């Protein structure tokens, strides 16, 4: 079983970040798409789009990188340091308004799936509605 | 039997009283239905005595039979006074 999609996507993204692969692939979903959009808005990727690979709706990820470094380790400074699907299917997390974390004391973001759509932490706070804590990203 | 009465709450030599509504058969500190006012013997403050008038009146209406000190306090506070 492809036992979670979101988690898988996140993993793929992480892998891409690790190996400096500019571009990666992931199957398509509404939820996934929304997440990608959010990421784009934040600035955590360059962009997304849905090309057909094979014959099945896949998804291009356009992978962001920091300026190519000088010194030992001239491998690019990362944009996404760490990305973690927090509400793993099983350990299912639901945060109300008082329980959303200011992740990294504000710098990076959590992503909250909510009644009022799929969105950032700040947005959630503003709208006062909490929900499923899909993923933490910094 | 329901009484408006006094509940001691301060300390040794320092008495302080809750004008309070409860059942007769309870400890003097006991679980009461409604706090309504407070009183101090030392008259130590500008406001040593206070009561919520309306609440007290309501209690009386139902048939809260106040103990005599409590009654006096109520009178002083202006709950028996009718205009």
């Amino acid at each position: 079983m492809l036992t979670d999609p979101i988690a898988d996507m996140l993993t793929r993204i992480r892998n891409a970040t690790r190996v400096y692969k500019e571009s990666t692939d992931v199957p398509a979903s509404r939820f996934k798409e929304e997440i990608l959009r959010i990421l784009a808005r934040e600035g955590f990727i360059k962009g997304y789009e849905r090309v057909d690979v094979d014959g099945k709706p896949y998804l291009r990820v356009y992978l962001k990188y920091g300026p190519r470094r000088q010194g030992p380790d001239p491998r690019p400074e990362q944009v996404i340091h760490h990305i973690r699907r927090i509400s793993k299917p099983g350990r299912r997390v639901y945060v109300g308004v008082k329980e959303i974390p200011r992740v990294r004391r504000g710098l990076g973001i959590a992503i909250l799936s909510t009644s009022k759509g799929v969105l950032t932490d700040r947005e959630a706070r503003k709208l006062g509605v909490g929900g499923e804590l899909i993923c933490e990203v910094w | 039997m329901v009484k408006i009465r006094l509940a001691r709450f301060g300390s040794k030599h320092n008495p302080h009283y809750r004008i309070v509504v409860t059942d007769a058969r309870r400890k003097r500190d006991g679980k009461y239905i409604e706090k309504i006012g407070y009183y101090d013997p030392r008259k130590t403050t500008p406001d040593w005595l206070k009561v919520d008038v309306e609440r007290a009146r309501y209690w009386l209406s139902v048939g809260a039979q106040p103990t005599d000190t409590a009654r006096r306090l109520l009178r002083q506070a202006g709950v028996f006074r009718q205009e």
């Binding site: 099983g90 350990r91 299912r92 997390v93 | -």
Partner: protein, 99 residues
């Protein structure tokens, strides 16, 4: 408010009576993981119109007997013995694991 429950009739082997399985789904007091929990209830029905494998709405009541403390309100769907089936299987399994 009288307690309104919704579960499945998993046994009628009694006069007027139905046994009702309620999946109560709730999060754990620490680990969060939502757990499916079962409580077999006894319910009163001066009809026996409600039969085995029927999903029913259950009302909290004044008691009729030692642990028979519910009235049947109304049917939701009939014949879903498939959900009963699991319960029966579990019961059967009970036999296996003793000595």
């Amino acid at each position: 408010p009288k307690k309104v429950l919704t579960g499945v009739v998993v046994s009628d082997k009694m006069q007027k009576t139905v046994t009702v399985l309620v999946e109560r789904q709730f999060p754990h007091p620490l680990y969060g993981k939502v757990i499916k929990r079962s409580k077999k209830y006894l319910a009163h029905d001066p009809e026996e119109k409600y039969k085995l494998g029927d999903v029913v709405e259950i009302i909290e009541s004044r008691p009729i007997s030692k642990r028979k403390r519910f009235r049947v309100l109304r049917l939701v769907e009939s014949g879903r013995m498939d959900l009963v089936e699991k319960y029966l299987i579990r019961r059967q399994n009970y036999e296996s694991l003793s000595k």
